[model samples]
Target: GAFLDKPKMEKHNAQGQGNGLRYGLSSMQGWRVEMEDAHTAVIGLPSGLESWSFFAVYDGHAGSQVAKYCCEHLLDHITNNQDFKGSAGAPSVENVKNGIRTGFLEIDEHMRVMSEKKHGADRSGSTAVGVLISPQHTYFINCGDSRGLLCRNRKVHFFTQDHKPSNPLEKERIQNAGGSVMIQRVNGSLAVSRALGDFDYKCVHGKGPTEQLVSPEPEVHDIERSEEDDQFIILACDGIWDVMGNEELCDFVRSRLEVTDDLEKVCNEVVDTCLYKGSRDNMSVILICFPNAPKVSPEAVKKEAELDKYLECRVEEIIKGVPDLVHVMRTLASENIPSLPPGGELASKRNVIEAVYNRLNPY
Candidate 1:
């Protein structure tokens, strides 16, 4: 919308990306209906103290080139940078954060300089979010609206704040840069103050063409690892967050993973569930499971029976309408999958409910 006088047309496709890390899984999605959403991660070596650094996530809006460019280049730059070299442990916390900041700015600068050389117009930009991890510390960084979350124990402990006009910190920065916040966007043009390629808004040598050129500077946070930090993390694009909350999604995973041991199936269920719940946007997600999560002794877990009792009650209510409850219960006791999606209006809602109810609950 910022590129022209009229809103442009669009196509929808929910694409995803992810890879297995040393100790966790990193994934993300870009659902067209959800706008551009992306994420990244790096985990510390559990055996000792080898370092890991990552910088990724290019949330493209106008087109995919900018985001694609980032996906190809950012993570490599972060790890290959000279900053992480040392025989001791990892680089200092400040150095790791600085490395990420340098990597993003360097990539942005590289893109801009290259475009100018090609005699091309600069219209592309994307929200950037990333993280770096070492055994002792982890750094969280954000330049736009895409996000990162860390779940310690079973609760969300920290998440990168979306950098938009809605945040007081962002408002002050935009104002200081002589830009006005309109409709949560800077100057009603750019929603994200910090990004990769918006030369129209660049103020490299001096002030930009208008007040809209807010420089991209990552808001970085350093968190020290602790014993209480039960392991799991999620990096996702805005598309997933628009319809689902971090805690809500985490609970769904926790519940399924508690009984179903297949990691890939767990991920597929997450993607499928998001779509069924009406996520029209591009979606990508990475669900990381720390070893300790599965290591909790059954005796320790049974202590949470109070939580299970409440869960059982909720499942019972969902199955109340099944005509042959006994038959449904028998089938569900052996299988652990949920029911199907909606079809034509022929079947009763209760039967659909029964089909689902039987799968997750028993009499």
Candidate 2:
């Protein structure tokens, strides 16, 4: 939560395609003292689960050690679980859910042991939200305040709930651990109710791992696959969710996909839009698209072209009207422009506006 004199605008972007899905991710260290976010995008799982895939986004606080550790090892813990690997057939939903829970607990314990070997100096923690896409189901795993959502049939079909200390169940657990929920945080310290690592909060007199103030248990939900209706699942940190709602983000993603088929570009736009909208935390997001996701339609392309041309024309008109650059910006904003990018409204189109202005009045 520390502030920086200026945000690092440079973005880290990536993309991958596999198992009949296209995925892309982007992250930026915005107004933060350090970039403590980590991510994982695996198209194919190891062992005999070639058809399965895994993706995760971890937003770390205090430090990035736990997040970096989980990004590389969390999937292995989940897949190698006894419940996840059935005898000789497809896995049951309940089995997968139990495996996901055990995996978080197991990883937490392993990290604790590793910390002890180093004289126990780490006090960092991370919120993890991930998806394990199997042949017929997408398993959503959530811990802490980060979020993941499914966009289906041009709407928000489902979204993972955030875990905060002020929530009823989370507060009850904190109380049981002899900890008070202050400022909606565990003892007015960590903001997340559940997470990986954060061993400082896990120490209760005689409480079990799951009974601690900050349990490393993930909530798992298994949704049956919908090829025709399931468009995409967006996994993002609080930095992005802090500024946008699920439906708004889904619509913005839909609009972006319609204009361009590149998943990386869409992800880049998402983070950039969040930054422009005044998100002051490190931002990271992953967009996983199905085969039926929006394509670059001619109608959408024509609409995008028309919008750009309109902006250029409007900028020229504004400059010709004898207003300065700053005044011209104000005038255009007051004109109530239409067909700007959805979810972000006109703010995300600032790039277009600035480009058109520069074209009209060179430096």
Candidate 3:
């Protein structure tokens, strides 16, 4: 079964201070060789950088080392930047953007330098998607396929762009680095055109930092925060996006939040729902709540009841007049449907039941 799991490792954390903004998060390991995903959430930074929050998701491939390392160190590099912490008053958008860009380069260089001495650094890499929220604006930073999305007024307000080899700019860089984008992958190897670590893909003849088969550069976006309309933001790995689109996930979390104020459970249910939708990967989700975010509403609870009743009635209609009961009863008498016998596994009883029901209904 694609849904096999070796008991997921789960974590939950939340904060509700600093500017009346808060966030809740959850991460689960499901259907993977090993959990290669990592995340971080921080509200109310150090004394100077108060009234701000930072959240990030890192999706690793090959191994979890890079993701774990980034989760521990990347934000340190960002916050240590002069523009972020050494400002006279508040940080300008340009200052913050430049600071983030510098942080990425600094960390990539650190990884590259460390790989020469470390054994595992060359084999592991991670996709990074992060958000920095201050009083005035929100900054979105992306390196690979993991995503950061903002929902405002019950609609998708912003989302990070996924970097893949097929993108025109990425393809140009790969070809210029003497690599080809075959099967939409750089040199038929890495799926993402940009990442952290994986030093094997970072080298090419006569290429600079940005002109590599897989560059470590990140793209950053700044959006002015609107307290009136901006509701919340989601930072998740590609596992969640593999099963749910930006708008679909936003709507799901929005509706779920309207039913219960437990954002951690909301994020946990998001991971469970993605797994149920057949996403065969590790899942992690971080949900940040704004001041004006919606609260638990009776309308949502009533709608959920209506939906449950509708589904119950619909299932009753489907299995109502089917004559397969006799067949099922006889099979149940001699065989186990959950665990089949040797010769009895030739055909699917579920298909047989469905076929009989459909023939009877003629739909």
Candidate 4:
């Protein structure tokens, strides 16, 4: 990890408050070779769909074409799906899910044609995770490892699961396509079991669309949107998840919100924190805050102030005569840290800080 130069950080943000909706998003190219992650945010819909909003994150591997293409066209396909468009009033959850599934497959087929005509032979793919927000229901769709997480009442309410080649169903499909999963990768190459624009995997001898080595079908889920319980939702790529768990991320975001309500800055802080914690991939995050959620209380603010005071004094005491500390800090800031053996579980913020101190001191 230390041998490679850091990827250029390409950051973007979109924040707005519109008709019963408020949102902020941030994406960054933290430490990867290229900026392959793309996102979409549509806070206001057209005439008939005024009550709905859409957001998504696409993480690409091998190339960025599929990711950027999806950002431009995927949501448009979903909103225009015949099944979704046929619903007259208050669409059923099943209809929405079906539309989402069909939208994914349609786009994959569309890309196959585009690839053949435009590039002749291309072997790039992208993972997609998105949320469709309506007045009464919220639908989530996932095709690969990029994730969608929801927080309710200051706790994690829901999260999307990753689709990997080693999973029972995924493995069976890959085997059916005459492909082998080695080291938990499709054909021992692709890490995800489902993605968009992986045309090279779609051309099995006799396999159908869903039976391809890497399927483009997405898993869809829907939940009732609650004005009282739903606080916020986060959409991010695997880079952020490599080093932080779902609950930890929700907690971190909540704490940062207590400090400031600027959601874009909070999202950027999440990307930065993951980089500091040694994630060696690109990072992107979308944060949507609902109106009915609770805000930072006075007591919580006081507690954080006290904790900050103690940490400042402790840091003053720890820096004395630490000549090698600057070197360690520079290495951590500019490059990935060296691999080390485990001492114990380092879960909390203090535990992580102390572990870094111990690494520098090595008493």
Q: In terms of TM-score, which candidate is stronger, 1 or 2?
A: 2
**Residue lDDT tens for model 1, 1-363:** 322232222222222223323222323332343244444444443233344545445577666667777777776555445553332554676666666667767777788788889986547777777666555665777777777777777778798888777577767767767677887887798777777777676763444422335555677888886545556656666655666677776666665456444555445555545544555555555555554444434643463354344334544654554546545434443444332121211111223344456566556
The segments of candidate 1 whose C-alpha lies over 4 angstroms from its true place after superposition are 1-56, 79-89, 204-212, 294-363
When 3 and 4 are scored with lDDT, the better candidate is: 4
Error of model 3, residue 261, in angstroms? 0.7
The 10-residue segment with the lowest total lDDT in model 1: 340-349
The TM-score of candidate 2 is 0.95
The C-alpha lDDT values of all candidates are 0.57, 0.90, 0.77, 0.78
Please write out the lDDT profile of model 4 over residues 1-363, one tens digit for every residue.
Answer: 131385555568889887576788888877665788999899866657787899899999888989999999998777778876767775577778887888888988998897787865547799999899988877888999999998889888999999999999999999988999998898888899999988888899788888999999999888788888899999999998888889888888887676567888778777767776677888999998898644766866676566545443444455555745444344333433222112111122333444456654777
Question: Could you tell which candidate, 2 or 3, scores higher by lDDT?
Answer: 2
Residue 17: error of model 2 in Å? 1.4
Better candidate by TM-score, 2 or 3: 2
- Give lDDT: candidate 1, residue 294: 41
* Backbone collisions counted per model: 14, 0, 0, 0
CA shift of 340, model 4, Å: 23
